[PDB]
Amino acid sequence: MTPQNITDLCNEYQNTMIYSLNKEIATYTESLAGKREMVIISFSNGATFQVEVPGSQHLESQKRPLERMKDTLRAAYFTGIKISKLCAWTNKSPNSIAAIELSNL
Amino acid sequence: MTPQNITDLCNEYQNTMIYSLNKEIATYTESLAGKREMVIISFSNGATFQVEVPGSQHLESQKRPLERMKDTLRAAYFTGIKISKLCAWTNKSPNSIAAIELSNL
Amino acid sequence: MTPQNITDLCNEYQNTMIYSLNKEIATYTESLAGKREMVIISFSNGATFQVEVPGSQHLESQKRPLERMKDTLRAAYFTGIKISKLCAWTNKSPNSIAAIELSNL
Amino acid sequence: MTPQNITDLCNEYQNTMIYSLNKEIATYTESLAGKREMVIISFSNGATFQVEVPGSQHLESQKRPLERMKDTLRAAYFTGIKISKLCAWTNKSPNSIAAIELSNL
Amino acid sequence: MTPQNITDLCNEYQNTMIYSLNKEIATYTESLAGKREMVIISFSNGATFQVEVPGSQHLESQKRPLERMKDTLRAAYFTGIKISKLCAWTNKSPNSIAAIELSNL
Amino acid sequence: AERTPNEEKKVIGYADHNGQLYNITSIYGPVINYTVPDENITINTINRTQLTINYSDYVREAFNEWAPSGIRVQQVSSRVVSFSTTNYADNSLGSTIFDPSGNSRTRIDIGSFNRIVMNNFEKLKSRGAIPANMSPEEYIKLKLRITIKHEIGHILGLLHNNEGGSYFPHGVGLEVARCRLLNQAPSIMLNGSNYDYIDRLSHYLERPVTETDIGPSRNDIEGVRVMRRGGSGNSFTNRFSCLGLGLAF
Ligand SMILES: CC(=O)N[C@H]1[C@H](O[C@@H]2[C@H](O[C@]3(C(=O)O)C[C@H](O)[C@@H](NC(C)=O)[C@H]([C@H](O)[C@H](O)CO)O3)[C@@H](O)[C@H](O[C@H]3[C@H](O)[C@@H](O)[C@H](O)O[C@@H]3CO)O[C@@H]2CO)O[C@H](CO)[C@H](O)[C@@H]1O[C@@H]1O[C@H](CO)[C@H](O)[C@H](O)[C@H]1O
Ligand SMILES: CC(=O)N[C@H]1[C@H](O[C@@H]2[C@H](O[C@]3(C(=O)O)C[C@H](O)[C@@H](NC(C)=O)[C@H]([C@H](O)[C@H](O)CO)O3)[C@@H](O)[C@H](O[C@H]3[C@H](O)[C@@H](O)[C@H](O)O[C@@H]3CO)O[C@@H]2CO)O[C@H](CO)[C@H](O)[C@@H]1O[C@@H]1O[C@H](CO)[C@H](O)[C@H](O)[C@H]1O
Ligand SMILES: CC(=O)N[C@H]1[C@H](O[C@@H]2[C@H](O[C@]3(C(=O)O)C[C@H](O)[C@@H](NC(C)=O)[C@H]([C@H](O)[C@H](O)CO)O3)[C@@H](O)[C@H](O[C@H]3[C@H](O)[C@@H](O)[C@H](O)O[C@@H]3CO)O[C@@H]2CO)O[C@H](CO)[C@H](O)[C@@H]1O[C@@H]1O[C@H](CO)[C@H](O)[C@H](O)[C@H]1O
Ligand SMILES: CC(=O)N[C@H]1[C@H](O[C@@H]2[C@H](O[C@]3(C(=O)O)C[C@H](O)[C@@H](NC(C)=O)[C@H]([C@H](O)[C@H](O)CO)O3)[C@@H](O)[C@H](O[C@H]3[C@H](O)[C@@H](O)[C@H](O)O[C@@H]3CO)O[C@@H]2CO)O[C@H](CO)[C@H](O)[C@@H]1O[C@@H]1O[C@H](CO)[C@H](O)[C@H](O)[C@H]1O
Ligand SMILES: CC(=O)N[C@H]1[C@H](O[C@@H]2[C@H](O[C@]3(C(=O)O)C[C@H](O)[C@@H](NC(C)=O)[C@H]([C@H](O)[C@H](O)CO)O3)[C@@H](O)[C@H](O[C@H]3[C@H](O)[C@@H](O)[C@H](O)O[C@@H]3CO)O[C@@H]2CO)O[C@H](CO)[C@H](O)[C@@H]1O[C@@H]1O[C@H](CO)[C@H](O)[C@H](O)[C@H]1O
Ligand SMILES: [Zn+2]
């Protein structure tokens, strides 16, 4: 079963949640520090998310997608586009991004 | 022979169809979740397409092109450019993108 | 005598010709279909060019430049900038891009 | 625990300091010369920072983040966006960038 | 040992010269032809520079920086950003770029 | 909609002699106070057609068209902005003097309107650029609205699309708010000597043009936003209005 949308996709995983945001990223933080090679984003209401440091929890097939998501979040920040939804793992803090939805007019 | 355009290309494959859209992407969904490392796009009329999770159906020569297409679709979503045509495999759900045409003619 | 410009470069190869366009790309086509992983562009006057599928005719040193050229063509298409000249091989159909010149002059 | 912001992150390392800038990059310098493959940025008040040449002080996990950071700094320079904070190692000259914060709050 | 700027960097190498341009790139040429996989740029006054074909004169640590410089030059051309200074090796024709400075000051 | 050429989306702002963009917030105040005579503009052309119009009302609509830039205006009874009528019959429909002192002045020439307005009406209607349906009165309404909105652009510190680098009484034209990545209608600040705005808008829309179609383009609006804060014409925040989109590549 290949999902058609982010909600169906998110429902294929345990410990995930959909956040319906419809707002721009307020702060973008990027780190190259050893063992903390990660991106953190936050919104104006204080909601905070990460793209995790690559680790043993990730399949080989996820390594390039982690980098793609960080590219997408950086582009979203620079352009000020609204994020429609995030699917995030709730068993990490900040909540860890699994998928993103961008939606327009 | 070498195709001159997307219709020629699409006619070189079984289970493909040309869709003439002339529409901007309405929704862009990107996932790094394991086994669902994919991009899904939809248009305002509900028409939905995927770039498939890389798998055994893909040649080694297709691995970088899968990533290029996902880059192109993200740029298309952000800029709101109209997509002229998609060549898509119809034996997948959502239909799976094989080629894209952007045209200002 | 080292090449200083696209004409010098083009003259270092057999079966190549300089095409002067001074036009934006009218159509951009990108395919990830297996054995047709290529880009085709056309201009309003109908002139059509490709970046070839990587193959045995390419040195290892050409593999990343093939990807760079496809990146440059996509960026040119999205930004609508004029292409000044293409150096292309005439022994492929569509004519195959060897080099590109962008000029604001 | 996983840090939530650049200050928490910066405090997880020795010889680091947070610089609050809220300024655009004034000069961007990029070198490909052997043993000096690096980027240097400066601000209007003379504050200067580098992304270090990759070396034995870097984990393998830091190699791509070094390149990402250089990408981010170039994009920040070109767009003229304000840099909110840098976390930098002070035991290098110029001070060496560990993390960056961009904020529109 | 601790360069702070492009003048320091250029003085760490033999056979280099500084050009103060403060001009946008007038012509951008990119080639994927075998043994000439290179970029050439020129300015309105005819000053011409290259990023060299990767070769035995390059350290492994310079391979990705060569690609980064070509990315930077292409971005500068597309946006019309002014190049402040180039540090270039004079024993190549066109002069070969070692470092670039962009300044808005 | 087709793809508007970059040259028709290019927007030029008025910089001073030192390469610094004029700040229209500093020039007009936070609220632009402007005056108009007893309205009642009247046009009389023959081929015959008569038409009477409230200058006050048409200026009002035009200003509202530019509102997305964040400007605020204020009509004031006669250093402020002036809208007047002249009769030079100068083959020139409208004209504006941009004055950094605040006394910028816009004129609408009735004599020119009476002489030259209809000269492209039948040419356009055949091109499919304006509806065959369109009446000679509506066309004069259309041209007047376009003219006023276009002159308002000059009031708000804009020059013509092709005047980057060109020298002017108070300085030089410098491109502002560049955005080539977002498709959009041609600028209403197209150089009228070189373009027919109605024709170009019609080419963009792939159909005949109405009053509801015309107005400042996305880049036109972003340009005035730049003019509202001024600063260096060399500033990247001033020069570009969608360069962040580059990150998506
Ligand atoms: C829930 C969990 O622990 N996730 C870890 C996962 O464990 C696998 C199974 O979990 C799912 C899941 O993530 O929800 C189950 C889903 O149906 C799968 N969905 C799809 C579309 O395939 C996903 C998916 O296959 C993987 O995520 C892709 O790698 O996996 C989990 O139920 C199963 O649990 C076993 C348990 O291990 C065993 O001891 C017990 O006896 O039986 C249980 C039930 O069978 O274990 C599966 C792995 O063998 O495994 C991946 C690595 O494969 C990760 O460790 C994942 O952790 C999350 O990883 C995320 C990033 O990918 C993120 O960091 C989250 O914070 C982690 O929890
Ligand atoms: C139709 C199909 O199954 N496609 C799979 C392909 O199978 C190969 C042959 O199919 C074509 C095709 O895809 O239409 C035939 C075309 O003429 C070829 N076109 C060109 C320009 O070369 C393409 C192309 O070579 C490949 O797609 C590139 O990899 O292949 C198919 O006809 C052939 O069928 C055999 C059959 O397997 C055998 O049992 C029977 O006895 O004889 C038949 C006739 O020879 O099998 C070919 C492979 O040996 O194979 C590729 C992998 O190489 C994929 O599996 C492809 O499936 C599609 O993959 C797409 C992504 O690339 C996408 O996911 C689609 O949804 C998949 O169906
Ligand atoms: C013309 C040709 O067949 N090109 C193929 C090339 O063959 C080599 C020699 O050709 C040139 C060339 O491409 O014009 C000659 C130029 O002077 C060279 N220029 C420079 C700056 O070095 C280039 C260049 O070295 C290569 O292109 C880099 O790979 O090569 C060709 O003259 C020579 O021919 C031999 C012949 O094979 C032999 O039977 C006969 O007895 O003697 C001849 C003269 O010595 O063969 C050379 C290779 O051994 O080789 C490359 C692969 O290295 C390609 O196959 C190239 O084909 C073109 O490739 C393009 C993409 O790179 C594109 O796809 C074109 O459509 C292909 O024709
Ligand atoms: C301070 C230092 O020497 N840093 C180098 C580091 O050394 C490791 C330990 O330092 C920390 C640190 O950097 O502050 C300690 C932190 O709590 C760690 N933080 C987290 C979140 O993990 C970091 C982190 O693990 C690494 O930075 C990631 O690679 O490490 C340091 O305290 C420890 O010192 C030993 C010492 O080696 C030994 O002589 C003595 O007997 O015991 C001490 C206490 O245990 O050594 C740790 C490594 O074994 O090591 C890394 C590479 O492994 C770097 O060399 C780092 O140097 C900095 O590197 C930066 C770029 O990554 C930048 O270039 C700075 O300028 C360098 O100083
Ligand atoms: C001048 C030269 O030939 N450069 C080649 C270089 O040679 C090395 C030493 O040169 C320097 C230099 O490039 O100026 C000396 C600098 O102080 C170094 N600066 C720093 C910050 O380290 C640089 C730097 O290390 C290298 O460029 C990084 O690769 O090197 C040169 O003085 C030394 O000469 C030897 C000579 O070989 C030997 O016969 C004699 O007995 O002793 C001399 C004095 O010690 O040789 C050094 C290498 O062994 O080597 C690099 C390859 O590592 C290149 O070949 C470089 O050529 C330039 O390369 C550029 C691209 O990187 C560009 O293409 C220029 O056009 C090339 O000339
Ligand atoms: Zn005008």
Side-chain angles (χ1 to χ4, degrees), chain B residues 104, chain C residues 23-25 75-83, chain E residues 78, chain F residues 3-12 161-162 175 177-187 190 195 200 217 219:
Chain B
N104 59 39
Chain C
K23 294 170 187 69
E24 71 279 10
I25 301 170
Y77 176 79
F78 274 75
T79 60
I81 61 152
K82 285 183 173 55
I83 311 302
Chain E
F78 270 71
Chain F
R3 181 168 187 168
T4 306
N6 289 344
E7 183 67 11
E8 294 177 39
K9 305 188 297 185
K10 181 185 300 175
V11 175
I12 308 301
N161 71 312
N162 56 6
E175 187 181 351
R178 175 189 291 181
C179 179
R180 304 133 130 186
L181 287 163
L182 294 177
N183 192 33
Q184 57 188 271
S187 163
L190 290 183
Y195 300 95
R200 300 312 301 150
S217 66
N219 288 3

Short mmCIF file of all heavy atoms in Angstrom, two decimals, chain B residues 104, chain C residues 23-25 75-83, chain E residues 78, chain F residues 3-12 161-162 175 177-187 190 195 200 217 219:
data_model
loop_
_atom_site.label_atom_id
_atom_site.label_comp_id
_atom_site.label_asym_id
_atom_site.label_seq_id
_atom_site.Cartn_x
_atom_site.Cartn_y
_atom_site.Cartn_z
N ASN B 104 6.81 27.07 -21.98
CA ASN B 104 6.22 28.40 -21.89
C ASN B 104 5.63 28.81 -23.24
O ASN B 104 5.13 29.92 -23.41
CB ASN B 104 7.24 29.43 -21.38
CG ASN B 104 8.47 29.55 -22.25
OD1 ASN B 104 8.39 29.50 -23.48
ND2 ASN B 104 9.62 29.74 -21.61
N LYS C 23 18.25 33.30 -26.93
CA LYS C 23 16.85 33.07 -26.59
C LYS C 23 16.75 32.26 -25.32
O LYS C 23 17.64 31.47 -24.99
CB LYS C 23 16.12 32.30 -27.70
CG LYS C 23 15.96 33.05 -29.02
CD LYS C 23 15.44 32.10 -30.11
CE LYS C 23 15.42 32.75 -31.50
NZ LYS C 23 16.80 33.00 -32.02
N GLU C 24 15.63 32.41 -24.62
CA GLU C 24 15.35 31.57 -23.47
C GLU C 24 14.92 30.18 -23.94
O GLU C 24 14.45 30.01 -25.07
CB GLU C 24 14.27 32.20 -22.61
CG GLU C 24 12.90 32.16 -23.25
CD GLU C 24 12.67 33.28 -24.27
OE1 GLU C 24 13.64 34.00 -24.64
OE2 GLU C 24 11.51 33.43 -24.72
N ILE C 25 15.09 29.18 -23.08
CA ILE C 25 14.57 27.85 -23.37
C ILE C 25 13.06 27.88 -23.38
O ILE C 25 12.45 28.40 -22.43
CB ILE C 25 15.07 26.83 -22.33
CG1 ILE C 25 16.61 26.79 -22.35
CG2 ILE C 25 14.45 25.45 -22.60
CD1 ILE C 25 17.21 26.00 -21.20
N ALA C 75 18.03 25.42 -14.37
CA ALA C 75 18.03 26.75 -13.76
C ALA C 75 17.74 27.83 -14.81
O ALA C 75 17.01 28.79 -14.54
CB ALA C 75 19.35 27.04 -13.05
N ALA C 76 18.34 27.68 -16.00
CA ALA C 76 18.09 28.65 -17.07
C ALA C 76 16.62 28.65 -17.45
O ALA C 76 16.02 29.71 -17.66
CB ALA C 76 18.95 28.34 -18.29
N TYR C 77 16.04 27.45 -17.57
CA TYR C 77 14.63 27.37 -17.93
C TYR C 77 13.76 28.09 -16.89
O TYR C 77 12.92 28.93 -17.25
CB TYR C 77 14.15 25.92 -18.10
CG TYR C 77 12.67 25.95 -18.39
CD1 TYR C 77 12.22 26.26 -19.66
CD2 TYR C 77 11.74 25.78 -17.37
CE1 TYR C 77 10.86 26.35 -19.94
CE2 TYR C 77 10.36 25.88 -17.64
CZ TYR C 77 9.95 26.17 -18.91
OH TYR C 77 8.60 26.26 -19.20
N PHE C 78 13.94 27.76 -15.61
CA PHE C 78 13.09 28.35 -14.55
C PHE C 78 13.25 29.87 -14.46
O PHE C 78 12.30 30.59 -14.13
CB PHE C 78 13.40 27.74 -13.18
CG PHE C 78 12.65 26.46 -12.88
CD1 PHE C 78 13.01 25.26 -13.48
CD2 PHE C 78 11.60 26.46 -11.97
CE1 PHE C 78 12.32 24.08 -13.19
CE2 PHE C 78 10.91 25.29 -11.68
CZ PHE C 78 11.27 24.10 -12.28
N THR C 79 14.46 30.37 -14.70
CA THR C 79 14.72 31.81 -14.56
C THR C 79 14.41 32.59 -15.84
O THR C 79 14.37 33.82 -15.84
CB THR C 79 16.19 32.10 -14.16
OG1 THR C 79 17.07 31.58 -15.17
CG2 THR C 79 16.54 31.46 -12.82
N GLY C 80 14.26 31.86 -16.94
CA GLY C 80 13.94 32.48 -18.22
C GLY C 80 15.08 33.30 -18.82
O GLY C 80 14.84 34.20 -19.62
N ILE C 81 16.31 33.00 -18.43
CA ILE C 81 17.45 33.73 -18.97
C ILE C 81 17.82 33.27 -20.38
O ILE C 81 17.59 32.13 -20.78
CB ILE C 81 18.68 33.63 -18.07
CG1 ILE C 81 19.13 32.19 -17.92
CG2 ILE C 81 18.40 34.31 -16.71
CD1 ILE C 81 20.61 32.08 -17.65
N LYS C 82 18.41 34.18 -21.15
CA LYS C 82 18.79 33.85 -22.50
C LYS C 82 20.02 32.97 -22.56
O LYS C 82 21.00 33.19 -21.85
CB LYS C 82 19.05 35.13 -23.31
CG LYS C 82 17.78 35.87 -23.70
CD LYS C 82 18.12 37.07 -24.55
CE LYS C 82 16.86 37.72 -25.10
NZ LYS C 82 15.91 38.07 -24.01
N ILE C 83 19.95 31.95 -23.41
CA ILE C 83 21.11 31.16 -23.76
C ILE C 83 21.79 31.81 -24.95
O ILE C 83 21.15 32.06 -25.98
CB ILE C 83 20.73 29.70 -24.16
CG1 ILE C 83 19.78 29.06 -23.13
CG2 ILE C 83 22.01 28.88 -24.47
CD1 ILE C 83 20.32 29.01 -21.73
N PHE E 78 24.05 34.13 -12.77
CA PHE E 78 22.58 34.16 -12.86
C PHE E 78 21.98 35.36 -12.12
O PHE E 78 20.99 35.94 -12.56
CB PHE E 78 21.97 32.87 -12.29
CG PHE E 78 21.80 31.76 -13.31
CD1 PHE E 78 22.89 31.09 -13.82
CD2 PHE E 78 20.53 31.36 -13.70
CE1 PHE E 78 22.73 30.05 -14.74
CE2 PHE E 78 20.34 30.34 -14.61
CZ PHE E 78 21.44 29.67 -15.14
N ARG F 3 3.97 32.83 -20.42
CA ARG F 3 5.07 33.28 -19.59
C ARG F 3 5.57 34.65 -20.01
O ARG F 3 6.14 34.82 -21.09
CB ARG F 3 6.20 32.28 -19.63
CG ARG F 3 7.36 32.70 -18.78
CD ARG F 3 8.32 31.55 -18.64
NE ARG F 3 9.37 31.84 -17.69
CZ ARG F 3 10.20 30.91 -17.21
NH1 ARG F 3 10.06 29.65 -17.61
NH2 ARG F 3 11.14 31.25 -16.34
N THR F 4 5.37 35.61 -19.13
CA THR F 4 5.87 36.96 -19.33
C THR F 4 7.38 36.99 -19.39
O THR F 4 8.04 36.46 -18.49
CB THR F 4 5.39 37.87 -18.20
OG1 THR F 4 3.97 37.78 -18.11
CG2 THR F 4 5.79 39.32 -18.46
N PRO F 5 7.94 37.61 -20.44
CA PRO F 5 9.39 37.77 -20.58
C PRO F 5 9.98 38.55 -19.41
O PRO F 5 9.31 39.43 -18.87
CB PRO F 5 9.54 38.58 -21.88
CG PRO F 5 8.25 38.37 -22.61
CD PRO F 5 7.20 38.22 -21.55
N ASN F 6 11.20 38.22 -19.01
CA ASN F 6 11.84 38.89 -17.87
C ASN F 6 11.89 40.40 -18.04
O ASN F 6 11.71 41.15 -17.07
CB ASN F 6 13.26 38.34 -17.66
CG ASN F 6 13.25 36.93 -17.13
OD1 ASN F 6 12.24 36.46 -16.64
ND2 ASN F 6 14.39 36.25 -17.22
N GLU F 7 12.11 40.87 -19.26
CA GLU F 7 12.20 42.31 -19.49
C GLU F 7 10.90 43.04 -19.13
O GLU F 7 10.93 44.21 -18.74
CB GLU F 7 12.60 42.61 -20.94
CG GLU F 7 12.79 44.10 -21.25
CD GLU F 7 13.98 44.74 -20.53
OE1 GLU F 7 14.80 44.00 -19.94
OE2 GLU F 7 14.10 45.99 -20.57
N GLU F 8 9.77 42.35 -19.27
CA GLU F 8 8.47 42.95 -18.95
C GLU F 8 8.10 42.82 -17.47
O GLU F 8 7.10 43.40 -17.03
CB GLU F 8 7.37 42.32 -19.81
CG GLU F 8 7.49 42.62 -21.29
CD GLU F 8 6.43 41.90 -22.12
OE1 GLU F 8 5.27 41.81 -21.65
OE2 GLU F 8 6.75 41.43 -23.23
N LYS F 9 8.89 42.06 -16.72
CA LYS F 9 8.71 41.92 -15.27
C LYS F 9 9.76 42.71 -14.51
O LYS F 9 9.77 42.71 -13.28
CB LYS F 9 8.80 40.45 -14.85
CG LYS F 9 7.85 39.52 -15.56
CD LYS F 9 7.87 38.13 -14.94
CE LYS F 9 9.23 37.44 -15.05
NZ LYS F 9 9.16 36.02 -14.54
N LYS F 10 10.66 43.36 -15.24
CA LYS F 10 11.74 44.15 -14.63
C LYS F 10 11.21 45.48 -14.13
O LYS F 10 10.53 46.19 -14.86
CB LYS F 10 12.88 44.37 -15.63
CG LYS F 10 14.06 45.14 -15.07
CD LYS F 10 15.10 45.44 -16.15
CE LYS F 10 15.65 44.17 -16.77
NZ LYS F 10 16.56 44.46 -17.91
N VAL F 11 11.55 45.83 -12.89
CA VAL F 11 11.04 47.04 -12.26
C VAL F 11 12.21 47.92 -11.82
O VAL F 11 13.16 47.44 -11.20
CB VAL F 11 10.14 46.70 -11.05
CG1 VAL F 11 9.71 47.98 -10.31
CG2 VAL F 11 8.93 45.90 -11.50
N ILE F 12 12.13 49.21 -12.15
CA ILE F 12 13.21 50.15 -11.93
C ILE F 12 12.77 51.21 -10.94
O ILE F 12 11.71 51.82 -11.11
CB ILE F 12 13.64 50.83 -13.25
CG1 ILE F 12 13.95 49.77 -14.32
CG2 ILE F 12 14.82 51.79 -13.02
CD1 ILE F 12 15.03 48.80 -13.94
N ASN F 161 10.37 50.11 -17.15
CA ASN F 161 11.05 48.82 -17.09
C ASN F 161 12.43 48.81 -17.73
O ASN F 161 13.32 48.06 -17.32
CB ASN F 161 10.20 47.73 -17.75
CG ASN F 161 10.13 47.89 -19.26
OD1 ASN F 161 9.88 48.98 -19.77
ND2 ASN F 161 10.37 46.80 -19.98
N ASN F 162 12.61 49.64 -18.76
CA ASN F 162 13.86 49.60 -19.51
C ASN F 162 14.79 50.76 -19.17
O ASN F 162 15.71 51.07 -19.94
CB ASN F 162 13.57 49.59 -21.02
CG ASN F 162 12.71 50.77 -21.49
OD1 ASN F 162 12.40 51.68 -20.72
ND2 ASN F 162 12.34 50.75 -22.76
N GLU F 175 17.48 48.91 -10.87
CA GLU F 175 16.52 47.82 -10.77
C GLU F 175 16.27 47.45 -9.32
O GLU F 175 17.20 47.37 -8.52
CB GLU F 175 17.02 46.59 -11.53
CG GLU F 175 15.96 45.48 -11.59
CD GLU F 175 16.44 44.24 -12.32
OE1 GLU F 175 17.53 44.29 -12.96
OE2 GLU F 175 15.72 43.22 -12.27
N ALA F 177 13.71 44.86 -6.55
CA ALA F 177 12.70 43.81 -6.36
C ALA F 177 12.69 42.74 -7.46
O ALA F 177 11.65 42.16 -7.76
CB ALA F 177 11.31 44.46 -6.25
N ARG F 178 13.86 42.45 -8.04
CA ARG F 178 13.92 41.49 -9.12
C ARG F 178 13.36 40.14 -8.71
O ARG F 178 13.68 39.62 -7.64
CB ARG F 178 15.35 41.29 -9.61
CG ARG F 178 15.44 40.20 -10.66
CD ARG F 178 16.88 39.85 -10.97
NE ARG F 178 17.53 40.95 -11.68
CZ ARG F 178 18.79 40.91 -12.10
NH1 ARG F 178 19.52 39.82 -11.87
NH2 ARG F 178 19.31 41.94 -12.75
N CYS F 179 12.51 39.59 -9.57
CA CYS F 179 12.03 38.23 -9.37
C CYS F 179 11.69 37.63 -10.73
O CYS F 179 10.66 37.95 -11.32
CB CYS F 179 10.80 38.21 -8.46
SG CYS F 179 10.17 36.53 -8.24
N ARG F 180 12.57 36.76 -11.22
CA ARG F 180 12.35 36.10 -12.50
C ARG F 180 11.72 34.73 -12.35
O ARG F 180 11.26 34.16 -13.32
CB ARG F 180 13.65 35.95 -13.26
CG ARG F 180 14.40 37.24 -13.50
CD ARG F 180 15.84 37.00 -13.12
NE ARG F 180 16.77 37.42 -14.15
CZ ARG F 180 18.07 37.20 -14.07
NH1 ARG F 180 18.57 36.57 -13.01
NH2 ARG F 180 18.88 37.61 -15.03
N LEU F 181 11.72 34.20 -11.13
CA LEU F 181 11.28 32.82 -10.92
C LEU F 181 9.77 32.69 -10.81
O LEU F 181 9.22 31.61 -11.01
CB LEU F 181 11.94 32.24 -9.67
CG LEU F 181 13.42 31.93 -9.84
CD1 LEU F 181 14.06 31.78 -8.47
CD2 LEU F 181 13.61 30.64 -10.65
N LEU F 182 9.09 33.78 -10.50
CA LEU F 182 7.63 33.75 -10.35
C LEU F 182 6.95 34.34 -11.57
O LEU F 182 7.11 35.52 -11.86
CB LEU F 182 7.21 34.51 -9.09
CG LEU F 182 7.67 33.89 -7.77
CD1 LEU F 182 7.27 34.76 -6.58
CD2 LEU F 182 7.13 32.48 -7.60
N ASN F 183 6.18 33.52 -12.30
CA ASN F 183 5.43 34.05 -13.44
C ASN F 183 4.36 35.02 -12.96
O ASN F 183 3.87 34.91 -11.83
CB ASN F 183 4.80 32.92 -14.26
CG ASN F 183 4.26 33.42 -15.61
OD1 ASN F 183 4.81 34.33 -16.22
ND2 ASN F 183 3.16 32.82 -16.06
N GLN F 184 4.01 35.98 -13.81
CA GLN F 184 3.15 37.10 -13.43
C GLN F 184 2.84 37.95 -14.66
O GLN F 184 3.44 37.77 -15.72
CB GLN F 184 3.82 37.96 -12.36
CG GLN F 184 5.17 38.50 -12.80
CD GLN F 184 5.93 39.20 -11.69
OE1 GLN F 184 5.77 40.41 -11.49
NE2 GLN F 184 6.75 38.46 -10.97
N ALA F 185 1.90 38.88 -14.52
CA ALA F 185 1.54 39.78 -15.61
C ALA F 185 2.68 40.76 -15.87
O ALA F 185 3.49 41.01 -14.99
CB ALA F 185 0.26 40.53 -15.27
N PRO F 186 2.74 41.31 -17.10
CA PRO F 186 3.71 42.38 -17.36
C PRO F 186 3.50 43.56 -16.41
O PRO F 186 2.37 43.83 -16.00
CB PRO F 186 3.41 42.79 -18.81
CG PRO F 186 2.03 42.25 -19.09
CD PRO F 186 1.94 40.99 -18.29
N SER F 187 4.59 44.24 -16.06
CA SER F 187 4.52 45.43 -15.23
C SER F 187 3.65 46.50 -15.89
O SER F 187 3.65 46.64 -17.11
CB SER F 187 5.93 45.98 -14.99
OG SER F 187 5.89 47.31 -14.53
N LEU F 190 5.70 49.35 -17.80
CA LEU F 190 6.30 49.21 -19.12
C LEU F 190 6.47 50.57 -19.78
O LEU F 190 5.60 51.43 -19.67
CB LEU F 190 5.43 48.33 -20.03
CG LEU F 190 5.35 46.83 -19.73
CD1 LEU F 190 4.51 46.14 -20.79
CD2 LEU F 190 6.74 46.21 -19.64
N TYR F 195 6.28 49.78 -25.62
CA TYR F 195 5.32 48.72 -25.36
C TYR F 195 3.90 49.24 -25.42
O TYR F 195 3.63 50.40 -25.11
CB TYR F 195 5.55 48.09 -23.98
CG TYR F 195 6.91 47.46 -23.75
CD1 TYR F 195 7.93 48.18 -23.14
CD2 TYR F 195 7.15 46.14 -24.12
CE1 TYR F 195 9.17 47.61 -22.92
CE2 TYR F 195 8.39 45.55 -23.90
CZ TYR F 195 9.39 46.30 -23.30
OH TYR F 195 10.63 45.74 -23.06
N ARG F 200 0.41 43.66 -24.41
CA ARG F 200 1.27 42.73 -23.68
C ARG F 200 0.49 41.95 -22.62
O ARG F 200 0.71 40.76 -22.43
CB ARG F 200 2.43 43.48 -23.03
CG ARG F 200 3.32 44.22 -24.02
CD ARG F 200 3.70 43.31 -25.19
NE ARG F 200 4.41 42.12 -24.74
CZ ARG F 200 4.37 40.94 -25.35
NH1 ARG F 200 3.64 40.79 -26.45
NH2 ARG F 200 5.05 39.92 -24.86
N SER F 217 1.69 44.74 -11.16
CA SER F 217 2.05 43.32 -11.10
C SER F 217 2.66 42.97 -9.75
O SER F 217 2.93 43.86 -8.95
CB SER F 217 3.03 42.98 -12.21
OG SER F 217 4.26 43.66 -11.96
N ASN F 219 5.69 42.11 -9.12
CA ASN F 219 6.96 42.81 -8.99
C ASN F 219 6.77 44.32 -8.83
O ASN F 219 7.57 44.97 -8.15
CB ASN F 219 7.87 42.51 -10.18
CG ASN F 219 8.42 41.09 -10.15
OD1 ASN F 219 8.08 40.30 -9.27
ND2 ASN F 219 9.27 40.77 -11.12
#
